[PDB]
Amino acid sequence: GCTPWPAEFAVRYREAGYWTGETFSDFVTDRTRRFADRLAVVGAGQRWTYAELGERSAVLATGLARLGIAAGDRVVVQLPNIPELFEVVFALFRLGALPVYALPAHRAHEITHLCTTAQAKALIIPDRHAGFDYRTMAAQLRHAGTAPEHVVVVGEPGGFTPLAELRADRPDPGVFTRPEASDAAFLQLSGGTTGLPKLIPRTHDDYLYSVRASAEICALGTDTVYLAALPAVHNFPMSSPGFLGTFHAGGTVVLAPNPSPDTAFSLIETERVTITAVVPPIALQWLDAVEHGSQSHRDLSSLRVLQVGGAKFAPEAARRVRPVLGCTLQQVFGMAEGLVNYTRLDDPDDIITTTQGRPISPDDEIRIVDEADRPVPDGEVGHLLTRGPYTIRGYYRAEEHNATAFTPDGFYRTGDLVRRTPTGHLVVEGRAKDQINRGGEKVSAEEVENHILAHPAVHDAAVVGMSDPYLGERVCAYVIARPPSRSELLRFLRERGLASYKIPDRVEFVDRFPVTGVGKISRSELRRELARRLD
Numbered sequence: 190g191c192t193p194w195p196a197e198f199a200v201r202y203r204e205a206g207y208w209t210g211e212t213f214s215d216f217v218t219d220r221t222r223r224f225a226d227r228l229a230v231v232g233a234g235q236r237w238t239y240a241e242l243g244e245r246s247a248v249l250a251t252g253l254a255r256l257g258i259a260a261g262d263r264v265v266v267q268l269p270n271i272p273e274l275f276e277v278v279f280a281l282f283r284l285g286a287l288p289v290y291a292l293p294a295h296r297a298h299e300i301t302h303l304c305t306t307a308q309a310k311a312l313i314i315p316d317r318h319a320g321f322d323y324r325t326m327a328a329q330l331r332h333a334g335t336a337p338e339h340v341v342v343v344g345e346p347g348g349f350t351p352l353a354e355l356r357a358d359r360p361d362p363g364v365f366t367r368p369e370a371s372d373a374a375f376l377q378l379s380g381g382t383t384g385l386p387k388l389i390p391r392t393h394d395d396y397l398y399s400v401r402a403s404a405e406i407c408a409l410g411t412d413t414v415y416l417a418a419l420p421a422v423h424n425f426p427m428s429s430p431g432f433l434g435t436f437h438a439g440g441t442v443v444l445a446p447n448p449s450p451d452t453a454f455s456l457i458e459t460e461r462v463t464i465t466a467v468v469p470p471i472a473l474q475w476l477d478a479v480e481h482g483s484q485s486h487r488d489l490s491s492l493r494v495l496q497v498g499g500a501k502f503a504p505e506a507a508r509r510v511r512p513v514l515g516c517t518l519q520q521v522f523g524m525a526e527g528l529v530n531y532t533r534l535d536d537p538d539d540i541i542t543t544t545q546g547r548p549i550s551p552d553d554e555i556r557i558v559d560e561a562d563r564p565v566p567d568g569e570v571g572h573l574l575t576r577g578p579y580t581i582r583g584y585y586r587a588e589e590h591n592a593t594a595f596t597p598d599g600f601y602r603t604g605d606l607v608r609r610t611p612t613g614h615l616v617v618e619g620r621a622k623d624q625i626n627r628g629g630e631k632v633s634a635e636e637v638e639n640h641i642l643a644h645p646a647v648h649d650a651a652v653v654g655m656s657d658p659y660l661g662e663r664v665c666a667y668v669i670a671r672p673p674s675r676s677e678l679l680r681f682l683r684e685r686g687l688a689s690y691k692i693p694d695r696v697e698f699v700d701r702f703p704v705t706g707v708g709k710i711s712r713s714e715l716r717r718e719l720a721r722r723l724d
């Protein structure tokens with residue numbers, strides 16, 4: 190159910206050296222041999238060399254093959270920032286199996302969607318993380334008939350398969366498989382705009398291209414110490430340049446269990462982190478913690494680059510990074526569907542602090558168009574369309590949606606409103622898609638509304654973003670009840686299985702939506718008007 194690049198583009202990208210033919214199977218073997226003696230992973234009291242990560246992943250791949258996982262099978266991986274993540278992912282790559290990445294904040298709704306859509310053979314989870322019991326979630330899917338036939342638990346397994354059972358056998362390279370580099374290597378989740386998130390297939394050639402190129406843009410090497418402050422399987426901390434870029438270059442990946450200033454600064458001090466990636470709300474927390482005293486003592490001198498991305502970062506705050514934290518800001522405007530934009534580490538500070546960067550590739554095609562797909566004069570704001578060597582041509586098994594998300598000639602409709610500077614840098618100025626961006630976590634208004642409408646006491650509902658100085662937007666729900674408690678409504682939404690960050694920050698019960706002409710405007714227009722009230 191994947192959509193391939195046209196043959197002429199594929200030829201172009203291989204001839205240009207973007208698509209090298211290397212697979213993630215090749216990657217695991219080559220990087221763990223090339224950097225064997227170096228420190229690869231620091232986390233949860235563990236310190237693994239590249240050699241140890243190689244041996245551990247070979248053992249785990251043998252165990253997954255014994256379990257029944259074969260080349261081409263999909264395996265949903267929903268693990269927190271713990272070292273087991275890497276050994277699990279590498280092991281799946283050794284087998285030619287496809288990780289399907291879920292984030293720790295995802296819940297029964299999203300996980301059911303991923304398992305059923307990807308027809309996943311296994312689900313890999315922790316026992317508990319941040320108060321949530323993933324074993325109970327997996328048992329809920331089993332009870333409903335939607336769970337993978339194999340559930341593997343890191344920690345205390347309950348009645349599921351403990352991860353340790355997959356380490357029982359010595360390595361057997363006979364069970365490994367090398368796929369084709371043009372095959373999908375894994376699936377990940379899109380931010381989401383309609384009722385359900387779409388799955389994104391990424392191939393070995395295109396993803397590894399974006400990783401190698403990002404590693405070069407971000408000056409990674411064996412001296413790199415990358416702090417994974419964000420959930421490590423998200424596109425940003427995974428490939429931009431993320432932990433994959435760090436492994437490609439031979440550096441050390443340090444796992445932060447949470448992004449709080451105390452935890453993160455302690456790791457930066459101890460492990461001498463050189464680069465990390467955060468969303469703007471976390472950046473603001475770190476800046477305030479240092480500038481206004483609480484963490485002024487911390488030694489952050491090893492930090493060379495602070496990446497901030499996923500949501501808009503105001504120039505006012507961007508200007509504080511070098512003076513407060515002593516490092517270079519890098520803005521990163523990317524998307525799970527492909528295109529990633531970086532400010533360059535040698536750009537002047539006005540470009541660094543006022544733009545969201547320029548694309549990775551010379552073959553990243555950028556069209557900024559009006560409502561009739563006509564290009565706008567250079568410098569004006571318009572809809573961003575993009576096409577390139579690591580941007581998909583379609584979502585997984587989503588042909589109806591693909592008809593609308595891509596133009597006939599293969600440009601992806603990002604849903605972003607941007608303008609272009611004379612140097613090619615982009616400035617993110619708005620959005621056109623139905624999608625509240627809560628400090629980097631994306632919430633579809635239509636999805637939350639659909640779940641709210643499922644409540645018996647509710648007659649209508651409209652979900653809109655409310656401007657927020659830290660998060661950009663919080664989630665506000667207007668609800669017309671034929672009303673239930675606010676606490677009770679949020680409880681029902683948690684019982685529905687909605688991701689943690691999709692639960693509304695604010696609920697306002699109303700006899701009618703406080704806008705003029707409710708029966709005469711579309712739902713999208715309604716949300717725009719309501720949100721205008723809240724700014």
Ligand SMILES: Nc1ncnc2c1ncn2[C@@H]1O[C@H](COP(=O)(O)OC(=O)c2cccc(O)c2O)[C@@H](O)[C@H]1O
Pocket residue numbers: 379380423424425428429497498499500501502520521522523524525526529545603605617620626629631
């Ligand atoms: N600097 C920015 N300013 C404004 N909006 C931004 C933004 N950086 C993303 N955004 C919004 O986030 C959407 C994509 O979201 P996502 O799939 O989560 O990926 C990511 O955030 C992501 C980020 C960096 C690198 C990477 O490799 C990623 O995958 C965009 O289209 C836009 O709306």
